[PDB]
Amino acid sequence: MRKTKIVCTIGPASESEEMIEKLINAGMNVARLNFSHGSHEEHKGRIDTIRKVAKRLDKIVAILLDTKGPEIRTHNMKDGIIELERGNEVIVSMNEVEGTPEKFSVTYENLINDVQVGSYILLDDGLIELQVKDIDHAKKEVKCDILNSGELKNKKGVNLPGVRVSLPGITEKDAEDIRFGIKENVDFIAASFVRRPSDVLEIREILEEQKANISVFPKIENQEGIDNIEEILEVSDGLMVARGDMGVEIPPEKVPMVQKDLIRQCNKLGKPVITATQMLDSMQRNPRATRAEASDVANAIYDGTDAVMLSGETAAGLYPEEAVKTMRNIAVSAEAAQDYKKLLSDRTKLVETSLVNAIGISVAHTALNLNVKAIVAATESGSTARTISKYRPHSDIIAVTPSEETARQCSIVWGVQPVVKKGRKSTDALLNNAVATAVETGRVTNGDLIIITAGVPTGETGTTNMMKIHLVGDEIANGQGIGRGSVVGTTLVAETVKDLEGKDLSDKVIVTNSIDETFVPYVEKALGLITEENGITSPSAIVGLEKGIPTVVGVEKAVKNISNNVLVTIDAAQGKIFEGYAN
């Protein structure tokens, strides 16, 4: 019960050891470092603060590094500020020039080759939108009709609604920035402005030089990105959906259909997805979010998001803790009121049916149907945790892993609470450890059911390929079961027939030596029966079977051993008797 994960952006208002503790307590699962700003120095400082606080609190929190990415920008402007009339013309020059209401320059000198007549060109996050009138490569200029009017500062951004923007995958800075990440064993790289698989592989080839093992999550901010979503995930570990960045390039009437589709496309492949930006932006100034924002977050959860990001709310905002507390609260509420039967049925149709997924499916169903308290998923890499997660079961997924670092990668995937236990080689070891790891988390106790799952043998494990259903211990007494049923009830040990006369409701399991004629009238009024010694056609057995009361005969010293009044579950098949509630 916590399920959807929370990414937080670290900055001035959350650098302190004091605050990072409050954020981790508030429910942070991944810290984000935004390399669009700040020096390497600053970030290293925050990486230390995080790691140390994280281990002091004994909690797994990953570190995500968000590249600035390529971008198109205006060169400087004459007087620093310049204006554009609403029916006029402006020439967008590939050669650098001082700004003016006519001539006006961009850093991406190759802009002229990506646009055509009638292509739109948005300036400063869509503040004022142009449109290409004529193109003469002669002078390398683009004549443009200024559609909406407004002002224009110096080094402001430019966007070309797709349009295959022909920037490279990564800046030279981005290379510098992701090498820094390799050096600090950072867990996630969120690559900006991704639009082709090329643009992700450019990162992954840097990672493979170092044999890094960092997950790469592309950002998808434009039509080319949307269009290539399948081909990109083929080559990616997860995905971030930046609504605000996306909103600049595509109509905001159309964004939530695209969010819903990308998130669904990630669910299909078990790849985690983060929904980002514009989440609780009002909490930068206020100590409580607006209805619109709550709805917005809750709908990301319903769309099927693995995680949910905070930006300025936690980075520079006046209320960083309250933002994270409030995020968790929406998350819990939204999940609280959702139908896991529909949810499973949905995924069972959505995700492919294959050898590779066969045990995600069976586990999910088994878990729902038998009401299993926890699924414990043994992984080296995480792929078993992800496989179980994609089928969205009510049951808590516990990821037991020997890798500290593939445990931080589990911190982002949906519904997985990872723990680091030390590597078992044999299957037997793995199963037993699983059951023990589960109990020690405090979530599962004695009555509860558990599904243990992993890829075995732990060596040749490519895919997850076995499950065991396990009852968490451990029959207090046992014998020869008569009938096939079961009941939970409170005990009433009887030495005499009068030791249960004028003091009997039903709802109780009686425990005597054997059954006389004097006992038969009372046994029918009871829930269950545990007799001490006897055979299958004993008077105790024959009265239990005939009266449809699940019983166990042949139970060692049942009168002395099993306690009076304490609540008990008897399983007639098996012939076992349990401490409290069972299954």
Active site residues: 32, 73, 219, 277
**With CB cut-offs between 5 and 8 Å by kind, which of a second copy, ligand I30, none does residue 583 bind?**
a second copy
- The closest residue (CB) to ligand I30 is 362
| CA 537 – CA 514 distance, rounded (Å) | 12
- Looking at beta carbons only, is 294 or 375 nearer to a second copy? 294
User: Which region among 62-70, 171-179, 385-393, 532-540 touches a second copy (by CB under 8 A)?
Assistant: 532-540
Binding residue per annotation — 149? Answer: no
Binding residue per annotation — 392? Answer: no
Q: Any contact of residue 466 with ligand I30 (CB under 6 A)?
A: no
Binding residue per annotation — 137? Answer: no
Query: Per residue in 372-411, is it b (16+ CB within 10 Å) or e — as a string?
Result: bbbbbbbbbbbbbbbbbbbbbbbbbbbbbbebeebbbbbb
Query: Nearest distance from residue 438's CB to a second copy, in Å?
Result: 16
Q: Which residues contact 22 (CB under 8 A, 6 or more apart)?
A: 320, 321
Query: Nearest distance from residue 51's CB to a second copy, in Å?
Result: 29
Q: What secondary structure letter does DSSP report for 424?
A: P
User: Which region among 44-52, 177-185, 240-248, 391-399 touches a second copy (by CB under 8 A)?
Assistant: 240-248
Interface pattern 182-221 for a second copy (x via CB under 8 A): ---------------x---xx-xx--x-------------
| CA 458 – CA 476 distance, rounded (Å) | 33
Alpha helices in 280-382 (DSSP H): 291-303, 312-315, 320-336, 340-350, 358-370
Q: Please pick, from the candidates 25, 369, 371, 561, the single residue that binds ligand I30 as defined by CB under 6 A.
A: 369
The single-letter code of the amino acid at 413 is V
Binding residue per annotation — 4? Answer: no
| CA 218 – CA 241 distance, rounded (Å) | 8
Query: Per residue in 235-267, is it b (16+ CB within 10 Å) or e — as a string?
Result: bbbbbbbbbbbbbbbbeeeebeebbbebbebbb
Residue entry with tokens 């500020």:
81
Q: Which residues contact 119 (CB under 8 A, 6 or more apart)?
A: 131, 132, 160, 161, 163
Q: Any contact of residue 371 with ligand I30 (CB under 6 A)?
A: no
Q: Any contact of residue 407 with a second copy (CB under 8 A)?
A: no
Q: Please pick, from the candidates 117, 318, 370, 573, the single residue that binds ligand I30 as defined by CB under 6 A.
A: 370
Query: Nearest distance from residue 300's CB to a second copy, in Å?
Result: 9
| CA 526 – CA 544 distance, rounded (Å) | 10
Tokens of 482: 């008569």
- Looking at beta carbons only, is 469 or 542 nearer to ligand I30? 469
Q: Which of residues 319-378 bind a second copy (CB under 8 A)?
A: 326, 329-330, 333-334, 336-337, 353, 355-356, 358-359, 362, 365-366, 369-370
- Looking at beta carbons only, is 179 or 365 nearer to ligand I30? 365
Q: Which of residues 326-365 bind ligand I30 (CB under 6 A)?
A: 353, 358, 361-362, 365
Strand 477-478 and strand 528-531: the pairing is unpaired
Binding residue per annotation — 67? Answer: yes
For residue 561, the SS3 value is helix
Q: CA-based diameter of the chain, in Å? A: 113
Q: Any contact of residue 436 with a second copy (CB under 8 A)?
A: no
Q: Any contact of residue 491 with a second copy (CB under 8 A)?
A: no
Is residue 229 within 8 A of residue 266, CB to CB? The reply is no
Tokens of 26: 């508030």
Site size for a second copy (CB under 8 A): 76
**With CB cut-offs between 5 and 8 Å by kind, which of ligand I30, a second copy, none does residue 438 bind?**
none
- Looking at beta carbons only, is 467 or 562 nearer to a second copy? 467
Q: Please pick, from the candidates 36, 166, 295, 561, the single residue that binds a second copy as defined by CB under 8 A.
A: 295
Site size for ligand I30 (CB under 6 A): 8
Cα first-last separation, the chain: 21
User: Which region among 60-68, 258-266, 492-500, 517-525 touches a second copy (by CB under 8 A)?
Assistant: 258-266
| CA 512 – CA 70 distance, rounded (Å) | 81
Q: Please pick, from the candidates 16, 213, 299, 445, the single residue that binds a second copy as defined by CB under 8 A.
A: 299
The single-letter code of the amino acid at 351 is V
| CA 15 – CA 18 distance, rounded (Å) | 8
Is residue 401 within 8 A of residue 424, CB to CB? The reply is no
Binding residue per annotation — 244? Answer: yes
**With CB cut-offs between 5 and 8 Å by kind, which of ligand I30, a second copy, none does residue 288 bind?**
a second copy
Binding residue per annotation — 171? Answer: no
Binding residue per annotation — 73? Answer: yes
**In this structure, what are the phi and psi dihedrals at residue 225, rounded to the nearest 5 degrees?**
-60, -55
Binding-site residues from annotation? 32, 34-37, 66-67, 73, 156, 221, 244-245, 277
Binding-site residues from annotation for ATP? 34-37, 73, 156
Binding-site residues from annotation for K(+)? 34, 36, 66-67
Using CB under 6 A, list all residues that contact ligand I30: 353, 358, 361-362, 365-366, 369-370
Binding-site residues from annotation for substrate? 32, 244-245, 277
